[PDB]
Every structure is written in structure tokens, then in C-alpha cells.
């Protein structure tokens, strides 16, 4: 995935071949591990973009993306 930013915050452009794998990227505050559980398809015009909240010792609820060290934005296409 391509690591960029959205208003100072890290942003992940996730491609199709990353479905099912732990997303890791270094940050001043250590290594960040986001988990993507998404309709994740091929990167195209039909993108969706939203935030993966920070979750410390809390079970996830009503979400398919979350990181454990620093909240991150994520973007991926839905095409197939």
C-alpha cells in the first residue's frame, strides 16, 4: 500500500493484493499495525475513504478497520 497523509494523519491507499494481510508502517511512536477486515477490491474510480480508529484493549464493534498505535485513514477501491 501507498503511505501518504490526510491533514497530518497517516493515510493508507490499499490495493487488492493486500486483502487479508496485516498492514504495518513505522511511525515516530513506534510501529503501527492496522487491521483491514473490509468489499475490498481493485483500486479504481469507485473508492471509499474512512478512518481506522485506535483501539487499546477493547474489542472492535461495528467496524472493519482499526489500528493499535495511531489512528489511520484508509482508502481502497471496490471494483473487481
Amino acid at each position, epitope marked *: 500500500f*501507498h*503511505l*501518504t497523509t490526510r491533514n*497530518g*494523519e497517516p493515510h493508507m491507499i490499499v490495493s487488492r493484493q493486500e486483502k487479508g494481510k496485516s498492514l*504495518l508502517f*513505522k511511525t*515516530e*511512536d513506534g510501529v503501527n499495525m492496522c487491521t483491514l477486515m473490509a468489499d475490498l477490491g481493485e483500486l479504481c474510480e469507485d473508492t471509499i475513504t474512512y478512518k481506522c480508529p485506535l483501539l487499546r484493549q477493547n474489542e472492535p464493534e461495528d467496524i472493519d478497520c482499526w489500528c493499535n498505535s495511531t489512528s489511520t485513514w484508509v482508502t481502497y477501491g471496490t471494483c473487481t
Partner: antibody, heavy 118, light 107 residues
Framework: AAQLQESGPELVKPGASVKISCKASGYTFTDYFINWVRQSHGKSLEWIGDFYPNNRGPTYNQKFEGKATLTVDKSSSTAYMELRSLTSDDSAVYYC???????????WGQGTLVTVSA | AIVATQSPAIMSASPGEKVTISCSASSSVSYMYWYQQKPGSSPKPWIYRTSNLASGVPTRFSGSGSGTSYSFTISSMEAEDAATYYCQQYHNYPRTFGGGTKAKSAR
């Protein structure tokens, strides 16, 4: 164990170009931003660049757009700054600091002095 | 695309005094920093976010602010404080520095 190792001090003539290296170690080079930083003698710091070595996206401070050109070699975990058409005002230190998610310069290099002189 | 403007350019102080150093951004950011730079040394990070100490920073330093205002505070100056200190913003592209504040000993 995070370290940045800049090149050594450079003279140089006006109209020359220089080519400052940056050699990261003790972290995933691809994972973090690389940020050059002018400081002239008796001035403050002056941000210049930022280069994400996963995808080789720059940005530039407008003031240094046309003056600088950032580039990274993944293979050697090295960042490079060219400076072009050097003038006496370009005489400064140039520090390479890595970011850590946000724009926060959390590890600096030892700083390359460049000294533009006739 | 935002300037940062840091309040005393200088600053005389004596050991024990409680220095304060402000930073004023031309639009609302939440990601700042305060570096510290010694006469023949790299800058070091001292504050991160708007109020996070960096690890291996004395609890003598503190950072607070929001809404374009931002403020370093040195709660009882040590000899080893004497330095420049340096706001950033890292909330929009061209990451900006302030013009630096130059805390020097007095007598």
C-alpha cells in the same frame, strides 16, 4: 538504534551543484518520511522537502522548489538531496530528519555544512 | 501555507525562573512540536503533538495550547536549558518552523 548519517562538509563554487547523502539505519527505511532542513548561520531552521521512500512522493517548500531535488535509494536505505545553481545564500547546514506518522522530526542527522564561495 | 510566529525572538532568564514561549499559527493545526537546539548540536525533539513530552525529556518542559495558540513552558529553568527552542507545524504540507526563541542566561 535509529541513526541518520549525512555526507561530510562541502565547499563549492557559485553556479555549482552539490549532492548530500543521508544513510538511515536501525529502522524500516520505507516506513517513514525523510525531511531536509536548511539552517543558515545565525538564522532559524527552514523546512525543505519530505520524500516518502515507499512511493517516492516529494513535497517541497515553495521557497526551495527549483533549488532542491530529493531522491531515495531503497536498496541502500539512503536519501539524497541535490542543490542546484548554488549561490552565497545557499551556505548553510542541511539536516535530514525522519518523521514518525505526523510531520514530527524525531531523529536528526549530524548536519552537512555547505559553503558557497568564489 | 501556514506561518508559525514565535513570540520572544530572544529571552533573558536566570536559573529557577519560569519561562514561557508562544508560537501562533496562521490557521488551526493540532500537530506542532517544540525542538531544542544547542550551540554545536542537532535539534532534538522535546514536545510532540501539542502536549506530549518526548521520551528522555525532563518533566520541567510542558506544552499546551489549541486553536492556533501554542505555548512551551519551562517550569524552573536549569543551566542545561539554555538554547534555542523551535515550534513546528506538521498538519499541512509545507511543514513550517517558527523563527526560533533564544533563551540565554542572565545577570
Amino acid at each position: 538504534a535509529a541513526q541518520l548519517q549525512e555526507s561530510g562538509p562541502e565547499l563549492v563554487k557559485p553556479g555549482a551543484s552539490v549532492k548530500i547523502s543521508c544513510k538511515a539505519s536501525g529502522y524500516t527505511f520505507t516506513d517513514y518520511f525523510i525531511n531536509w532542513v536548511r539552517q543558515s548561520h545565525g538564522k532559524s531552521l527552514e523546512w525543505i522537502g519530505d520524500f516518502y521512500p515507499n512511493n517516492r512522493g516529494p513535497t517541497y517548500n515553495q521557497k526551495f522548489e527549483g533549488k532542491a531535488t530529493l531522491t531515495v535509494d531503497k536498496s541502500s536505505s539512503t536519501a539524497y538531496m541535490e542543490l542546484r545553481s548554488l549561490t552565497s545564500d545557499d551556505s548553510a547546514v542541511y539536516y535530514c530528519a525522519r518523521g514518525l506518522w505526523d510531520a514530527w522530526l524525531s531523529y536528526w542527522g549530524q548536519g552537512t555544512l555547505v559553503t558557497v564561495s568564489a | 501555507a501556514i506561518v508559525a510566529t514565535q513570540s520572544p525572538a530572544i529571552m533573558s532568564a536566570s536559573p529557577g525562573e519560569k519561562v514561557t514561549i508562544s508560537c501562533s499559527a496562521s490557521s488551526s493545526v493540532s500537530y506542532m512540536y517544540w525542538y531544542q537546539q544547542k550551540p554545536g548540536s542537532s535539534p532534538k525533539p522535546w514536545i510532540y503533538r501539542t502536549s506530549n513530552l518526548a521520551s528522555g525529556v525532563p518533566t520541567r518542559f510542558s506544552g499546551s495550547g489549541s486553536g492556533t495558540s501554542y505555548s512551551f513552558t519551562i517550569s524552573s529553568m536549569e543551566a542545561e536549558d539554555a538554547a534555542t527552542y523551535y515550534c513546528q507545524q506538521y498538519h499541512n504540507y509545507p511543514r513550517t518552523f517558527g523563527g526560533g526563541t533564544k533563551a540565554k542566561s542572565a545577570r
